[PDB]
């Protein structure tokens, strides 16, 4: 995986290409 | 929480699958 900073849309869809298609949320909260 | 591990820093595969559903 990469080791580099991620903002924005670079946040959002490093973090849905590590879900693959489950969905996020980006504090989820209970 | 993504943007303090991700944006001001560096994050990775084991820190954002904590805020996969």
Do not use: D, W
């Not at chain 1, 903002?7 to 590590?18: F, K, P, Q």
């Not at chain 2, 993504?2 to 944006?7: D, G, H, N, P």
């Amino acid at each position: 995986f990469v080791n580099q900073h991620l903002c924005g849309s670079h946040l959002v869809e490093a973090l849905y290409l590590v879900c693959g298609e489950r969905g996020f949320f980006y504090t989820k909260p209970t | 929480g993504i943007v303090e591990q991700c944006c001001t820093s560096i994050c990775s595969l084991y820190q954002l699958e904590n805020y996969c559903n």
